[PDB]
Design an enzyme around this catalytic site. Sequence first.
Site, PDB file in Angstrom:
ATOM      1  CG  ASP A  35     -63.827  12.624 -52.336  1.00  0.00           C
ATOM      2  OD1 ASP A  35     -62.859  12.935 -52.573  1.00  0.00           O
ATOM      3  OD2 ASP A  35     -64.302  11.659 -51.838  1.00  0.00           O
ATOM      4  CB  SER A 199     -46.683  14.312 -61.699  1.00  0.00           C
ATOM      5  OG  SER A 199     -45.671  15.300 -61.823  1.00  0.00           O
TER       6      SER A 199
END
Length: 330
Positions: A35, A199
């Site tokens: 994770d 992004s």
Amino acid sequence: STGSATTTPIDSLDDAYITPVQIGTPAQTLNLDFDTGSSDLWVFSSETTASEVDGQTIYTPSKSTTAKLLSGATWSISYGDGSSSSGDVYTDTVSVGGLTVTGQAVESAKKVSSSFTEDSTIDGLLGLAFSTLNTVSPTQQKTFFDNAKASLDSPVFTADLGYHAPGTYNFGFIDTTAYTGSITYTAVSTKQGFWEWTSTGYAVGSGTFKSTSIDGIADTGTTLLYLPATVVSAYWAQVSGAKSSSSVGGYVFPCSATLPSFTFGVGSARIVIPGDYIDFGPISTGSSSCFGGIQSSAGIGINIFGDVALKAAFVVFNGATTPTLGFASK
């Protein structure tokens, strides 16, 4: 040194991925959920409340000659899906894919929430976010990666998750045969303890690319792609019959649909998520309503590039002095 381990989807939907991890002496192999959105290595154990164990493999520290109680240390964690666990702490030898760390903090669960009990395939979590998020008290502990880093050939790990197939976590090297083209690297903020990046935009299907900054985290422990409501609405508007269902808890779509791809920007590069990766199947057995793999982050407080996004790429988690993230197509 290096390590290399195969990671395998837990079910036919890629709801999560498990990777075998050797703990203790002699080795006890547990299948852990790696994770990159958390920083605790915790396991089901001989200390876990018996009624909360249902099929998991447990770590038994009393059977490990290298286990030592970390006296006075406790831990307690809650995850974004509302699940939680807590317990006490041992140090022991931990190996992943041939890479060994001695003195790793292994957090032994005394209690786990129902979602963990109900998932027989996940024996615990191995956190790969920054150690500043580790929950051990009163002495915070380091992640497996943080402990291994100085010994690694290069201070990196890579995630290469498969779509409905096994993939690979590598530590200490970049497998240049595992991706196509070049890797595009992008800046990381560690301010919130995550692999947080921005992004450069998105496209839906064959549509034009929208240049827009989307801050979010690269999180292998989250199944889906969670993005701003504007972006998510633009995606699902291209699927006839798709709608947001408050009763189901997100966007659903007719199982008869053919889903468009979704592209996200990494600098000037582009990663394309095929439409099929966005299908999470019937909302309940036999239903013709299917659950979407792109969902709104509104009210999470952060955008999450979970497995839906990451499995479309070869992803480099660069833990150099100034961390960065790399993405390549594959």
